[PDB]
């Protein structure tokens, strides 16, 4: 796992995506911290959202564990930062690098699945009153991500 | 196509596509399928942090010449 | 686009996209993606690039 | 002029080049950013390798080396 993780880190330094940033916490290559910038023209705009990444020892054959530490309002991310997302579980591919995983999660923010939600109350609001959904997500971005 | 855009593929390789400002996202995916062999159903294109939906056009997303789209794998929250 | 950046991109292109260490040496049938070495291939039932089912793997040689 | 160059990427993907010294503080970098891009320092959030950078620390303190890329994130204006 280590050699591939070092390569990803080096490959990131050369050319990180505009939307995200990541690297080791302290002296531990298996534990990273990451940022996702809220997409422009979304209720998350202007937000910087922090995440923890834990690479298992059989990475990349098994997915990294990824969770938000910044609170975020979303049908598929709970108050503990847990992300319910198929590419972190049964739809993992070993070719996904941490950069692509973070971009994938970022693309989930404006593309939730309210029909199979992690937070049912938020999903009902998203489906019935999108202006209310957007207002609350904006308020949480202000309170936690700025 | 009348302009060029870039796609960063799953492996981080950057390819160049010839497209029209009004090309649909599905047409872009069809070009990626021809160059990289990825079925469109497995392609998820991201620009400015957001996924690009089939049925919309590049101009719908203000994607300009020499924009870079990021390709990831089809995903679903749950 | 320096000579080193181009040489690195050519070497990375020949390199396994899973372990990122050994050179690619196996093509998946029928999807045709050439993306893993022989040490990574036995662990895979679906192609990491297109999720296609792997029905066979041919050892490939770039002569 | 600078001992090393670093790069600063904006949310739009534009990358700017800065001439810096390893001992430069994050506050110094924000001043250079204001010079090149016209963004006032108090509106800048700088991110490197998953961390938001604190004003009083140096580039070396954050393991920022030649050709490193930092992220410039504007506060919602
Ligand atoms: Zn391999
Ligand atoms: Zn394939």
Author numbering:
A (entry chain C): 2 to 147
B (entry chain D): -1 to 76
C (entry chain A): 556 to 618
D (entry chain B): -2 to 74
Excerpt from the paper describing this PDB structure:
Cellular inhibitor of apoptosis protein-1 (cIAP1) is a RING-type E3 and belongs to the inhibitor of apoptosis (IAP) family of proteins. The RING-mediated ubiquitin ligase activity of cIAP1 is essential for its function in both cell death and survival pathways. Dimerization of its C-terminal RING domain is important for E2∼Ub recruitment and ligase activity. cIAP1 has been shown to function with the UbcH5 family of E2s to catalyze substrate ubiquitination.
To better understand how dimeric cIAP1 RING domain (cIAP1R) activates E2∼Ub for Ub transfer and how UbB could influence this process, we present a crystal structure of cIAP1R bound to UbcH5B–Ub and UbB. The structure was refined to a resolution of 1.7 Å. Because cIAP1 exists as a biological homodimer via the RING domain, we used crystallographic symmetry to generate the structure of dimeric cIAP1R-UbcH5B–Ub-UbB complex. The structure shows that cIAP1R dimerizes via the RING domain, the C-terminal tail, and a helix that precedes the RING domain similar to other IAP family RING E3s, such as cIAP2, XIAP, and BIRC7 (17, 23, 41). cIAP1R's RING domain binds both UbcH5B and UbD and stabilizes the UbcH5B–Ub complex in a closed conformation. Additionally, the C-terminal tail of the second subunit in the cIAP1R dimer packs against UbD in trans to stabilize the closed UbcH5B–Ub conformation. The cIAP1R-UbD interactions primarily involve His588, Ile604, and Cys605 from cIAP1R's RING domain contacting Leu8 and Ile36 patches of UbD. Crucially, cIAP1R's Arg606 forms hydrogen bonds with the carbonyl oxygen of Arg72 and the side chain of Gln40 from UbD and the carbonyl oxygen of Gln92 from UbcH5B. The UbD-UbcH5B interaction involves UbD's Ile44 patch contacting the Ser108 region in UbcH5B's α2-helix. UbB binds UbcH5B via the Ile44 hydrophobic patch of UbB and UbcH5B's β1–3 surface surrounding Ser22. Here, UbB's Lys6 and His68 form hydrogen bonds with carbonyl oxygens of UbcH5B's Pro17 and Pro18, respectively, and Leu8 packs against UbcH5B's Gln20, thereby placing Gln20 within hydrogen-bonding distance of the backbone amide of UbD's Gly47.
